[PDB]
Design a protein around this ligand. Structure first.
Ligand code: Q0U
Ligand code: Q0U
Lengths: 140, 140
């Protein structure tokens, strides 16, 4: 059972998500990121259960990271699905701000607008060690 | 004197560059990346000195990473200057390919066209530990 689930957008946050994985593992956290721990079987249910199983939900807000969520009322976008799962399970949600533009809440589906109300950590290229230390402080 | 200099484009390669720095330090290499080791003074001289001092030159070829080098015949662009320094000192150049598209040599200044002749390592999001192990194989 991993302590941390990392949710990210492949086309914009793959590298930061991987970097967060390495640091958090070095600090003793078990981390789920799909390319390392999503294994055999039907992945829709495996992903959902992995979010449920992890106490902490680290959300990589790269630029445009929530764009595919907009108008996704059928909840088929995977970042959307992961966030809704994290919200519904009362997870400790820790957004990571990396060039993200804060959208007006009303452009997002109602079931995930609450993600914007969580306190986010700004990724600092110049102060990465301090960013990591702060992320660790936010984890449970 | 760091063993490895990491050259990269801030606007497309910062995360991979830091990811590479973390991994290489975990495997025992001293690494120069500007946000961690570029300290006080005139940075023109310090950057060039740091390239000259490092046996290995790890070049992060994110998408469009050499765009600003094109037509930079006065050699004002910083990745251009770092590459020319690495080529001039005969450093072990190790390009890391991350969605980079191979240009025709002639679009680049003649003093850095040689960089394309170096065997580059494909960055694999799904096989990152294998990518890293290949990179450590390339370093001296
Ligand atoms: C299952 N899967 C898709 C997926 C996994 C996790 N997510 C979560 O959702 C966020 C990313 O969301 P994002 O929107 O950025 O990704 P998509 O562009 O939607 O994915 C579409 C791309 O996956 C490939 N694709 C489609 N179908 C399969 C398939 N049956 N098998 C293998 N690849 C498949 C296509 O070739 C597209 O190129 C993260 O937080 C993740 O946790 C979203 C999607 C994989 O990748 N498995 C490989 C690994 F296990 F290593 F991850
Ligand atoms: C000195 N410097 C600029 C620089 C350093 C290294 N490189 C190498 O060259 C590649 C990157 O090339 P790239 O084209 O991506 O860089 P630019 O985006 O053009 O930089 C322009 C931006 O730097 C900032 N900028 C300008 N002037 C100064 C100044 N006097 N002081 C602090 N910031 C300055 C503005 O905010 C611009 O917005 C890498 O391989 C690096 O090794 C290029 C440029 C810093 O950063 N110092 C901070 C730290 F030490 F933490 F790095």
């Amino acid at each position: 059972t991993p302590d941390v689930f990392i949710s990210y957008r492949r086309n914009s946050g793959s590298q930061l998500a991987s970097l967060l994985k390495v640091h958090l593992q070095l600090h003793g956290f078990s981390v789920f990121i799909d390319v390392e721990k999503l294994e055999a079987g039907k992945f829709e249910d495996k992903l959902i259960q992995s979010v449920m199983g992890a106490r902490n939900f680290v959300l990589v807000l790269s630029p445009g990271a929530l764009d595919k969520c907009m108008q996704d009322h059928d909840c088929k976008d995977w970042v959307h699905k992961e966030i809704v799962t994290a919200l519904s399970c009362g997870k400790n949600i820790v957004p990571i701000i990396d060039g993200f533009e804060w959208p007006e809440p009303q452009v997002l589906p109602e079931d995930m607008q609450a993600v914007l109300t969580f306190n986010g950590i700004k990724w600092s290229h110049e102060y990465q060690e301090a960013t990591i230390e702060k992320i660790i402080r936010f984890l449970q």
